Design a protein around this ligand. Sequence first.
Ligand SMILES: N#Cc1ccc2c(Oc3ccc(OS(=O)(=O)F)cc3OCCn3ccc(=O)[nH]c3=O)cccc2c1
Lengths: 406, 534
Amino acid sequence: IETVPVKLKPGMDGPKVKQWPLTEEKIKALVEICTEMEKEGKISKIGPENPYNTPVFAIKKKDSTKWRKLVDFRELNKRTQDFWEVQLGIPHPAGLKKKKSVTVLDVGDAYFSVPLDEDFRKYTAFTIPSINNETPGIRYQYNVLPQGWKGSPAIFQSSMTKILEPFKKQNPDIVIYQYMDDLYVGSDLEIGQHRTKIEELRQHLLRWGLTTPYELHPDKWTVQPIVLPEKDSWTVNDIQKLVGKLNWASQIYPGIKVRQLSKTKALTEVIPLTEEAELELAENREILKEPVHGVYYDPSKDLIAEIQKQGQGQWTYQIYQEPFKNLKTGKYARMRGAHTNDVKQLTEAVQKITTESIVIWGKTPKFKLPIQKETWETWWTEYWQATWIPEWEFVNTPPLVKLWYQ
Amino acid sequence: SPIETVPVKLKPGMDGPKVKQWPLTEEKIKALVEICTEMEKEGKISKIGPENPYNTPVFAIKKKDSTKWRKLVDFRELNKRTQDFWEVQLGIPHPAGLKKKKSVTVLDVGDAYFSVPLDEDFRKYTAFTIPSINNETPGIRYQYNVLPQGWKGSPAIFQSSMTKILEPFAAQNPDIVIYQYMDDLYVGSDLEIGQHRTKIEELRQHLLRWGLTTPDKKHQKEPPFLWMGYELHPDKWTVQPIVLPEKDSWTVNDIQKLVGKLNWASQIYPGIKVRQLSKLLRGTKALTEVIPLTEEAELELAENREILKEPVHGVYYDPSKDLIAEIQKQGQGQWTYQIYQEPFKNLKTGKYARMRHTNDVKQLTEAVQKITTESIVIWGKTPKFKLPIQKETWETWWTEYWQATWIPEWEFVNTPPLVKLWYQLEKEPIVGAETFYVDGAANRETKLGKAGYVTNKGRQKVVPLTNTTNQKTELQAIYLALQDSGLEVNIVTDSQYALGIIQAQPDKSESELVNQIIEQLIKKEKVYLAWVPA
Ligand SMILES: N#Cc1ccc2c(Oc3ccc(OS(=O)(=O)F)cc3OCCn3ccc(=O)[nH]c3=O)cccc2c1
């Protein structure tokens, strides 16, 4: 099979990203994985004439007791795919977000059966690192379509469309969308009917040579409503926090009636709700009930996700592209009795938000994560169960607005 | 020389060097021809002249004299034009991470670059010229067959070549560990000394069969080894002796160098401080201006002079015995730590300083993070921690902090100064306590301002302020309300800045006002701060 030629964006040079230091455990797992890969043709050792590099990591995908290699191809994706969303794009179905159940099948192993353009392999270099700078580091490049690269499913989509065509014929109501290594498969069936259909698709893929080794429900109540507290008795400081919350929402919603509620008592003194005050409160709860105006998804600008830690395992998030023009807000919360911690919750939340973002727009967002950069860079792999990796950056000034999104 | 070459191409769309050969003395020309025929005799440079349009300058000099001159080539114009390579050793192994071997040998490899071949189709770009008498007579033209001295590709290609030559001997000798550095090999083994020396001779012979020469005498001086500013003894490591100078005046350069040597020493000497001594550097980047030493910095320099008077050593790493790090607070944002496996000899030491209103527990957490990173680099695992903080203190801080934080396996140590939380604001307002509606304001131009309060009981104060800012007066209003209230007080400000600073629960600051506010918040019993729009 001939190779699809890959000529990346003019003037752009290849990735030159440093490799993170790793635990001995993970270095050993990487050496094992890569020795089998070299033995099978998928990667080859390289020399000093190849200056590029692309980070690698060891994770455990889908709660397995066996390791898995994860290549961070973000830099190479920006440097090639920004002309391979154009030349070889995969169109994103606008109806996948509307099916009542959506399952995510991993179909990554597929790419390993297709060779990669020889002139391109240089740019898939990666270093398995040594401890204490003791040995040079082991240098590989790919000879087959690598998982994690956005060009692989692009190149493979002709094959994927052909393999899937008999199923798509037998099931014309089902939606199938390929994001990098996963088919997202949506249906309006009962959950058991849906599971039956998903296993039929598994066996259809299998009897065509695609090995494949947890459902979403995107009737998920898009941008969530904020509610004012409801109380039998209203104190001075209750009126104060209510006023302050309602003034912050003047940035998102325009028509919050304020003055009737703004009219040197002690904080704990209970002030009775005026007729004009309860009038303004009702008008404001109503003007909050409805969704926002002018909020439309622009497909030229990037998506932005912000997360806030709420305590007791709760986390709120907003996804937007213009401030206060939220495209989607929601709330994540880990298991009630499970042994979890902050960074575990942050990682599962980032993953959940990214999957939602794929289902809805076919793009991932850039995260503004509430966490020390070096902490995240050290611990994010320990719970990362996904094969893609979103862009991110770190917040260090806190929201003195914390409750306003709870 | 039977070594497989590495293919090298030029940066895309460039030609080779066509530089001028600015002639020099005839005696230099004679010395150059002597060394050039002696280097051709060994096939390192072959002489082909006619159809090569490329040229690179050549100079001659004597530095370390065996009664002989030496030839060198300014390869700048060629280096600028050749492709990038895989970089280099990107840093140094730390001695604390080495594992003791019963023997180690150092092997300096000889004319390393000149005994590794250069890719054939690239050799034309190394071409250079010798003139006779200022272009009155033509000169002789050469090119290189081997890695030229100081060319961009020589180090990484020599590393790759040496690694490949080593791996056959490495595979017929799994009991032996070979480490590479720019020109050296370090060979360690737990073989009996006679066997270790037989293997070192076998390795030398192996390398000789590939063109690489090696010290034929007794090998590089026995331990201790003076390597990369370290001293490596068969059972310990330390830094090479660090001598701080005593002088009257100090330029910014001299304090830069003193701060540097102190940081270097801090990896094994426990207790070194650099806070008040580099507070001098932040002023500007002017190189030769003389800086007056402060009194704090003078005590700091003396204090380091003392803790540096007696030598200290570190041990090497035992992978069978677990890894421990223990942390201590020092002072003005300064922390130290020790990493050990046993109680009388550290693997290494170190210090953490704060960069930027700060908090002790958050600072400890950043120290744990710096150490965790270093541990993963040096040894490939993370230490178990010994921290001067209590599980309830820390559990309280991280359950309330706005960032996520990873709190590794840690055990509490009761060495003072303990790390604690000194005050905690109320979550809900306080019944029975006075309420202070505080505000403050300055003027951007006149730098005059006011701070004041009105309380629900009818109490009112206004105090004037000179040389202040809106934020300074905003905090001064809160300070007034704390000064003039009882042990329970509700305070109401319209200053996001103020509420942010104070809600951060800082412990100290480089701002005396916030320190007085902190001492009040410690003195008070229940304080509920609250915010309203301006
Ligand atoms: N010039 C120079 C120089 C010399 C030697 C170096 C060096 O030796 C070693 C090589 C492999 C080793 O094996 S390993 O890392 O466990 F796999 C362990 C090693 O020396 C660590 C323990 N040590 C050290 C000295 C000693 O006398 N006695 C002893 O015990 C390592 C790095 C840099 C070196 C630089």
